[PDB]
Hints:
part of a larger assembly; 3 chains; alpha/beta; 16% strand; binds adenosine-5'-diphosphate; Formate--tetrahydrofolate ligase (chain C); ligase/ligase inhibitor; enzyme
Amino acid sequence: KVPSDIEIAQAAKMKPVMELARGLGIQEDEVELYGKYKAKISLDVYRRLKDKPDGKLILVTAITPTPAGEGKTTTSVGLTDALARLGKRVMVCLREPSLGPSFGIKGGAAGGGYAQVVPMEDINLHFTGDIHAVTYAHNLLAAMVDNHLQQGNVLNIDPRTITWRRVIDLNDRALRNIVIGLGGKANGVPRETGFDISVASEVMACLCLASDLMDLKERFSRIVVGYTYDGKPVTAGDLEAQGSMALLMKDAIKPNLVQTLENTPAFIHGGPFANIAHGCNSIIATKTALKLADYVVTEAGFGADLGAEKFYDVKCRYAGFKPDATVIVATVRALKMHGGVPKSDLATENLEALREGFANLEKHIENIGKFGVPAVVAINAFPTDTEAELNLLYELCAKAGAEVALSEVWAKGGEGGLELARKVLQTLESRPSNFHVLYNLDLSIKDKIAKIATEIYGADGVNYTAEADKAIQRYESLGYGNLPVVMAKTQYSFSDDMTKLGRPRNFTITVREVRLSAGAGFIVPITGAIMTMPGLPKRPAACNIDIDADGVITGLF
Amino acid sequence: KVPSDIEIAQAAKMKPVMELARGLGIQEDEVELYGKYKAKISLDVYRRLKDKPDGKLILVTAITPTPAGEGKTTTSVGLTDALARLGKRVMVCLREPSLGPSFGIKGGAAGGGYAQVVPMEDINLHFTGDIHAVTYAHNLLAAMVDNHLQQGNVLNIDPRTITWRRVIDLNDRALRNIVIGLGGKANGVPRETGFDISVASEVMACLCLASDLMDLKERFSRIVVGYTYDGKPVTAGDLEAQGSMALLMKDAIKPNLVQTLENTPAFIHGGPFANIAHGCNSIIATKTALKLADYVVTEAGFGADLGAEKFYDVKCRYAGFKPDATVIVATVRALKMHGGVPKSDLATENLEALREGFANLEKHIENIGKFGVPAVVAINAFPTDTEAELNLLYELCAKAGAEVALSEVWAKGGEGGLELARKVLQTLESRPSNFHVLYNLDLSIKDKIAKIATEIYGADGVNYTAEADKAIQRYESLGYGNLPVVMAKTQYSFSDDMTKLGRPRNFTITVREVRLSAGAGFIVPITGAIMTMPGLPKRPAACNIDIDADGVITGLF
Amino acid sequence: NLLAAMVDNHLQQGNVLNIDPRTITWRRVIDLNDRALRNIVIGLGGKANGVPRETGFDISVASEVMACLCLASDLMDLKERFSRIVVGYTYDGKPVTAGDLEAQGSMALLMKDAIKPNLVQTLENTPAFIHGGPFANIAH
Ligand SMILES: Nc1ncnc2c1ncn2[C@@H]1O[C@H](COP(=O)(O)OP(=O)(O)O)[C@@H](O)[C@H]1O
Ligand SMILES: Nc1ncnc2c1ncn2[C@@H]1O[C@H](COP(=O)(O)OP(=O)(O)O)[C@@H](O)[C@H]1O
């Protein structure tokens, strides 16, 4: 018997975040509660502590994802709980989930098992209203664009080249492509546009790479909404919108102090797209936790090929962060799959598969290697992984020359994470990390993409469509050449072939389109149509969700 | 002499709401803070005081609106504050403003001068996120309708008969008329629709008319979104959205405790339109106040002919309230506009036009009479009124059997309302009310409409277009005939012609359209052209809005 | 376009054949160079006005009707080909042809003079037929 995630977080025992705020030496006029159990820590905290030295930066990443599931949050949070069970002054920084999944597929634990962050309900509903403000700032900008068209279009924008869309945090496919502006001289200018899920907002992206508020304000100002008739780009700043957008963000820029079932301080702040964007919680939440703990467990989206890579290449580069360790997660199950084992064959023990599957992990370790960062494999263990496999895998990481550990934080709490914690410590004490950015700003865009594609995915090279080259020609020329590179591609493989599992070689990566996030300050190579607006299943969670007289919720998890 | 509104909202010391909370007999386990100066109060409070007697209910209303501004919210707060001075246990209930105005037309205070509920900024912006919840629940329903189409359209909704629009709390004209569902079979069902500003949402109206959560859930279920190809209604019940929507409103349902400049406790909750909806703050807020205090002041959008009338015929009806008194706000200024005087020369004394305009106010007093509620006029003092004009206003007011007070609450705060406060108290001590609604629900839709039109508006009779006659017959045959009537008409005339100021005679009203709010529980006849989505001006306030590092806001107020 | 008109009417009249409007391959045609018509949304205005859907126009000579005119052996053959024309698919993916909407006789009738070749001549009075005019890329 293990009870369900929800029953767990429910029977759990939360501590007023005000005391946790206290225990980290957050002043009480810097806390801003939302009930006894969530709060916004003013930015003033960091800026009074900007010199006190940063704790030690630990990134949790993982192997390329699989239907089997890796448990990268579970084990990013469990490690956190072990490090507190060892009297380390440690936090965990995490991403806020979109609201949308809650009502479609289902709501999920900020982690899972005995490695959750709480309160789980609030995290999955409106929480502190973070995403409501993004949405509202994005759409106020769009509002202002369409209105600017209505008022005579002084800036001579071609309505048909407007890249600025709209957001809503519901999986609504009906809004993917729409026409707005209908009904005459009074109601605007008809045009084609659409809606993406709000977490994919560039505004969401900025939230997460803004340094202070005035950085968010100015990033806003840089955003490309669309181009004039002569091809000249127009910005949020041209529309003199950056003010009001910043204003709508005033409270959302502040990170949200929650906690674990084991009362370790957690930040939850930001939650951007991991493909068309960098995949991390905000910089604010990390740079703050850094001045507040001696250890900061944090994480990034997908496998290490995308999350970690960008974590280093965009976030760390921006923030001046110098990560220290990095855990890479894995299962004998997720690895059996990378050895041509269909999801039904995860039942039978399979010593032979686990060997070839390993190729995925080894590749990652090398790639983490490539940053001057001390890896550590962590192994999320599963109820039917017979010990045959475990040691066989255990072997292969050491046989591949990097540290390895069993992780039982799912089933056992901070206790199951002690082993791994210790190695992270062994590593933190004895293994310094000369982190370097995998590339240089001044490289041409293609050079940059080559690097990542060649060095990280392990490809023989990159190929570029007619439009893709045309677009890069446009941007280098507009000056947007300096920026980093965010790699819009599948996650389920090192390649773009969503089915090329393991370490496929001989392949090349093909770049179909190239979008700009001037505001976030990056550039997005696309290697496959990107799902920016999911739709609801045949029967949405919504249909089965309910709340009674007592406030009892069913169907949410 | 008197500072600005924003200057005032920052100077005055706010008391931790938890105190105000306790001061009212609200247990700690019933208050959830949103910082120090905001709180949601539990619905458990009303339940634990179900059997205490109600304080006195006092409605603040006004003569016919002009573009000049009228005096209402400011009197509500000002009256409240004077009563607290006079020693009385008093609360004021107010509506939450939409986010929209803040960026286009203008963000003004919840009141003004020294008669303001605060914290200003938070009330005007995201507040405690109620409107966001309303927004998101309404659009989740929308999303669910379209998904229904896409998933085989089992309920057989004719997309084209869909009445459920979408909402956003921005002034976005371009969204009024849209076509969605485009892109292929993968992307939903192409159809026409649009957005309304969030506070026009039936969800908002249900929030404001609900008795608690399970009632709000029920109303939700009764919401009609569209019709089968056969003309049979399809409700949100039918798509099983009520639990989700409810769940999304679980914090939105509790009223928000806040306060005036003088720390008088104050509820802000709900915020509907006064034309397609009843334009009152919530029943939950009002009905709790009546338990926690001996005097509750609340108010209604637009003029007495609209807000007051709907306050009595809808709100009080749903709730079994009985107004003990009612204040009508008049200004010498506007009463002259009603006597012909254009906006440009309102400062010039003109007793004859003032005598003519009084007709407007006279008609309103008569109308409050018809509900059994003793009236008291409040003259909102302006520096350019002459003593002669004021005295003439008191003459007519008494010659019309109404007590009247001058009210300098905008400048002097609670003190400028003592004379009024005392007159109100004199009326309560000596003229106990005989409250009754204007009309019985038995009457047909056309009878109920006639009775309002003739008794209240002073209309001769009422006309219909063929479309209105079809709707009324549809609504009747579908059994919504015994519903209350909410008249969307212009606010600036008793007539349905916005130019016909003063006390128009020999006129007819025309009902062009009839929509239905089955969840809110009423029928909406439309007379003019009704704007359920304002749009941005030439140079929107959002362009002039900034915030710097010090947190200092400019061009927002 | 009569066929087109008949497809949409089919939708409006209760959509008995259960065409998914969105899978409709039968566009409309006009023998003008009109770019603005390539991508359109039709069927708007209310239940009185048809079924909103995406579609567009092709220049008339690209029309399959033109191609059938040019490949037909006579009228009854042109009628048959017509009937076999696929306009779209049921929600189930099964094809719905012009046969299914019973348009082939009408279309045929509309082509009763169109079917005969047109005799004319060269500058030197050598006899000359002009008849048919399809695209050489999507058609022959
Ligand atoms: N060891 C385990 N056994 C069973 N279920 C697990 C285990 N670890 C994680 N899970 C569940 O599966 C999901 C995957 O873990 P999570 O950390 O959320 O994945 P990721 O962060 O890689 O998306 C979690 O929601 C959790 O409930
Ligand atoms: N006596 C007065 N002198 C100056 N300004 C006033 C006075 N009374 C009201 N106002 C202003 O009018 C504005 C809008 O009118 P308000 O007082 O809210 O009345 P209403 O609710 O009828 O619109 C407020 O922001 C307030 O500052």
